[PDB]
Design an enzyme around this catalytic site. Sequence first.
Site, PDB file in Angstrom:
ATOM      1  N   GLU A  95      -4.867 -11.281   9.435  1.00  0.00           N
ATOM      2  CA  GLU A  95      -3.764 -11.884   8.722  1.00  0.00           C
ATOM      3  C   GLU A  95      -4.222 -12.237   7.319  1.00  0.00           C
ATOM      4  OE1 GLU A  95      -2.000 -15.149  10.599  1.00  0.00           O
ATOM      5  OE2 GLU A  95      -0.627 -13.852  11.705  1.00  0.00           O
ATOM      6  N   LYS A 111      -8.219 -12.973   3.868  1.00  0.00           N
ATOM      7  CA  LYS A 111      -7.926 -12.139   5.036  1.00  0.00           C
ATOM      8  C   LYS A 111      -8.736 -12.659   6.224  1.00  0.00           C
ATOM      9  CE  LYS A 111      -8.398  -7.236   6.240  1.00  0.00           C
ATOM     10  NZ  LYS A 111      -8.654  -5.974   5.620  1.00  0.00           N
ATOM     11  N   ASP A 158      -6.955   5.222   5.017  1.00  0.00           N
ATOM     12  CA  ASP A 158      -5.663   4.581   5.188  1.00  0.00           C
ATOM     13  C   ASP A 158      -4.955   4.462   3.845  1.00  0.00           C
ATOM     14  OD1 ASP A 158      -3.608   3.468   6.748  1.00  0.00           O
ATOM     15  OD2 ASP A 158      -4.547   1.485   6.747  1.00  0.00           O
TER      16      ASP A 158
HETATM   17  O1  LIG Z   1      -6.959  -6.082   3.402  1.00  0.00           O
HETATM   18  C1  LIG Z   1      -7.326  -6.219   2.220  1.00  0.00           C
HETATM   19  O2  LIG Z   1      -8.217  -5.670   1.670  1.00  0.00           O
HETATM   20  C2  LIG Z   1      -6.340  -6.989   1.330  1.00  0.00           C
HETATM   21  C3  LIG Z   1      -6.688  -7.347   0.026  1.00  0.00           C
HETATM   22  C4  LIG Z   1      -5.790  -7.947  -0.835  1.00  0.00           C
HETATM   23  C5  LIG Z   1      -4.478  -8.199  -0.438  1.00  0.00           C
HETATM   24  N1  LIG Z   1      -3.532  -8.829  -1.321  1.00  0.00           N
HETATM   25  C6  LIG Z   1      -2.161  -8.895  -1.224  1.00  0.00           C
HETATM   26  N2  LIG Z   1      -1.496  -8.584  -0.071  1.00  0.00           N
HETATM   27  C7  LIG Z   1      -0.083  -8.727  -0.217  1.00  0.00           C
HETATM   28  C8  LIG Z   1       0.805  -8.418   0.961  1.00  0.00           C
HETATM   29  C9  LIG Z   1       2.230  -8.548   0.863  1.00  0.00           C
HETATM   30  C10 LIG Z   1       3.064  -8.273   1.928  1.00  0.00           C
HETATM   31  C11 LIG Z   1       2.559  -7.833   3.191  1.00  0.00           C
HETATM   32  C12 LIG Z   1       3.411  -7.539   4.304  1.00  0.00           C
HETATM   33  C13 LIG Z   1       2.885  -7.123   5.502  1.00  0.00           C
HETATM   34  C14 LIG Z   1       1.476  -6.976   5.638  1.00  0.00           C
HETATM   35  C15 LIG Z   1       0.640  -7.255   4.579  1.00  0.00           C
HETATM   36  C16 LIG Z   1       1.156  -7.703   3.313  1.00  0.00           C
HETATM   37  C17 LIG Z   1       0.309  -7.992   2.186  1.00  0.00           C
HETATM   38  C18 LIG Z   1       0.300  -9.144  -1.471  1.00  0.00           C
HETATM   39  S1  LIG Z   1      -1.073  -9.387  -2.546  1.00  0.00           S
HETATM   40  C19 LIG Z   1      -4.106  -7.869   0.861  1.00  0.00           C
HETATM   41  C20 LIG Z   1      -5.040  -7.271   1.713  1.00  0.00           C
HETATM   42  O3  LIG Z   1      -4.669  -6.935   3.002  1.00  0.00           O
END
Ligand SMILES: O=C(O)c1ccc(Nc2nc(-c3ccc4ccccc4c3)cs2)cc1O
Length: 325
Positions: A46, A62, A150
């Site tokens: 998450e 994360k 991915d």
């Molecule tokens: O895994 C990583 O390396 C990682 C690194 C940076 C990051 N930053 C950010 N994520 C979001 C974001 C917005 C809406 C969403 C809806 C469903 C699922 C996920 C979601 C993630 C906005 S800014 C997210 C990451 O997962």
Amino acid sequence: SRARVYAEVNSLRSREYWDYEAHVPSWGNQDDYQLVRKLGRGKYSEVFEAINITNNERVVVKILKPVKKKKIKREVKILENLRGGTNIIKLIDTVKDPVSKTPALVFEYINNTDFKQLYQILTDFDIRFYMYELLKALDYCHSKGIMHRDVKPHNVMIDHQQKKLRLIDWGLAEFYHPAQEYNVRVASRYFKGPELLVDYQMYDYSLDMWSLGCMLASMIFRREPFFHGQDNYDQLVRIAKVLGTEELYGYLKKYHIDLDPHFNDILGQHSRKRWENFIHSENRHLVSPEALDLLDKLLRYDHQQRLTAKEAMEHPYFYPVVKEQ
Ligand SMILES: O=C(O)c1ccc(Nc2nc(-c3ccc4ccccc4c3)cs2)cc1O
């Protein structure tokens, strides 16, 4: 069979570089971070927007479902090896709750614009620019011996106001070693290369270039996702209805690939389609001869014939971007 570029790069490095099972992260204290809002959730994580209370920096945390020790070490080691890489999400810290020891990864914050809204307003130059920037990230990771596995819109964060792009979510990424057999259950359905769909395990960096090609297609044609299968079998059918079935069978023959016989009922026979067939009034301003030439060189069955990220970056389609930079 073997990557055309960067094939031996991990064998030329210290074993410590790629032997992630032996990696021992330094786990800092998660109590330095205040969680502000949940941004999303995955199978094994998450993601939260957070503030580092020691310096007031906005970051993303994360939180990892910790039952996957080897997979955790893999993602951490890959991110460390990629630090400083162009347009790769920056890993700021690796932390644990100091009591429960649940691990979490801390990344730079990006104020991304949702791809479903963004892709509807991109200009020709915008697509060129963002694709070039994404290619820089892929060339970098491939040069570092790593397949992302991915690549998809959700993993390409774009701040369209600041013109910043980051390739995120390295949790499926793996080190490339020649002749290694890899799990084909990677990538989102719509972005899986034909090699995955036909259970060919000796894939390489070029898998990411298929996925990039799918993204390019969706952007210039405004059909997102571009190949919209209903399951992994139908996904290959969708590809074959564009690239052709005879061309598929030639690929399988070259690599001695066994085709699951469930495909016999569903593939049919399909001529290769001209890419110009996807042009109409709503996307014509995004399509050019250059764009189609590039796309045609990416969305090929034969993973060894697809452009490398560098070759793609080198294509005339990106000349306007290079001239500006
Ligand atoms: O895994 C990583 O390396 C990682 C690194 C940076 C990051 N930053 C950010 N994520 C979001 C974001 C917005 C809406 C969403 C809806 C469903 C699922 C996920 C979601 C993630 C906005 S800014 C997210 C990451 O997962």
